[model samples]
Target: TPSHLSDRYELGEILGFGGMSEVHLARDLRLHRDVAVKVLRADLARDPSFYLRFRREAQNAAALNHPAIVAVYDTGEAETPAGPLPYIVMEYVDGVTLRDIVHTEGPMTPKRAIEVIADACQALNFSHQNGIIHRDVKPANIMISATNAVKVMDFGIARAIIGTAQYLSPEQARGDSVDARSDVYSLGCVLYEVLTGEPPFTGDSPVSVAYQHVREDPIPPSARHEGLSADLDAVVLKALAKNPENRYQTAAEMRADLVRVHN
Candidate 1:
């Protein structure tokens, strides 16, 4: 049974749920603030590998104190009848996820898409500079506030930069270390989604998408959206290059192209 978390947090209600965790909107009694509490799946809680990764996420994100990156306040175990459930306390963001926005609004105008993505790029650049590469940079992880500020969430995959082969790139996915370029590739995927209203390459299975990411060339954004500029299409294409070395070397470089188009 789920009991009240540490005396410092007053759990409210579930905000959302994910494949590996559940999120709760809770009141941080100690700091007198609201926070999002992410609790790991019960089964994974007992796994040493999960805890190691959880700790790595906390450490990586804690090192990044940027406005665009979600701030991690604390992480530890909460007593439960089942035992101890690992939990992470993060800043409660009042906003809609980019996935929701895209679903509700369809494909956003290039200008709006660029604006939101540029914000994310800024955050990614900051993370990259500090040697943290967010392996998962999809729309669902991007949040847009009421005032239009963009924030990136979920640094759980950041440590793919140096870890077991599991989720790393094919090369890295094979066992090599992940790095900034991996993120550049994911960002390219995001850009493709924003412009095309769909992932560049989707298959019947996750393995298909992963394989495509390692081998296929995605359809150009202009081909999907006639109004999208050729220059922007080129930008997205370059970033999505199958070979990591062929992609934008850094978020800063990609952001520069975005800024040029923005102006």
Candidate 2:
């Protein structure tokens, strides 16, 4: 047998893990290259509409093409003992996520941190131009290649908006529709943690942390680490602004400040 996935690939090992999918390392028999295959959660496949939702996610993500963004190769279904499993074939990035780096090493230095985020800003700017918003912008979703290239993964994942308020912007946390600036708010939190050791808002529980997101002022990143530039601190705070109107209006607007800080 060619295998259930032989309609295109030879599924190999599990490359990455996710809450709702398992990204497998697969050999593209036709293309003679490697790829990552995201298999939708078995339980999710049982739902009639979820299959369409899964495919739609692939369609939206596949539309993106940027050096800092992961590429989506294909989308289809594979047979399983349980049933048909919707899967997404994406670029097999060889790198550890920003989350892994942050965990292994403590908070990053100014040059390093700003460089990484500026790269992300470039990707976000590109996506926003296409009218796509990646509601979830976190360390885990940002990948660092061996040569230090950035690849932002999971563009507009439904799972991101479905669950937590910790990363959600003030607008999203309020259960309102969000735009590019909303992602700007979340990106600030990621940059803050990269510079400091934790997110801008943290509390005893998710509710309280979310309360801080909706209500409290963030302790400036400079407060967490001495010798961090005042210019850098100001940039982080501007992005963390409680009001989206007060935040950097777009990724380009923020990246200018980020580049200045880097220089």
* Candidate 1 runs further than 4 Å off: 1-3, 160-176
Put down candidate 2 lDDT per residue, 1-263, tens digits, no spaces. 12548467888877777766677888898989989888888876788676676777797788779999999988877777787778888988889987787789978888998999999999988888887888889888899988789999875363222435567788878678888888788888889888886788777887888888887888888888877989998999999888888999999999999998777
Positional deviation of 146 in candidate 1, in angstroms?
Answer: 1.7
Clashing pairs in 1: 168-173, 169-173
Number of clashing residue pairs, candidate 2: 0
For model 2, the local distance difference test gives 0.82
Q: What overall lDDT goes with each candidate model?
A: 0.79, 0.82
lDDT per residue (tens digit) for residues 1-263 in model 1: 16458777888889788667788989888889889888888876788888777778778888889999989989888888778888888988889887797788878889998888888889998998887778777888889888788989988767533322212344545455667887776777777787778878777766666687677777889988878998998889888776778878988898899999889
Candidate 1 Cα lDDT to native: 0.79
**What lDDT does candidate 1 reach at residue 202?**
74
| Candidate 1 Cα RMSD after full superposition onto the native fold (Å) | 2.9
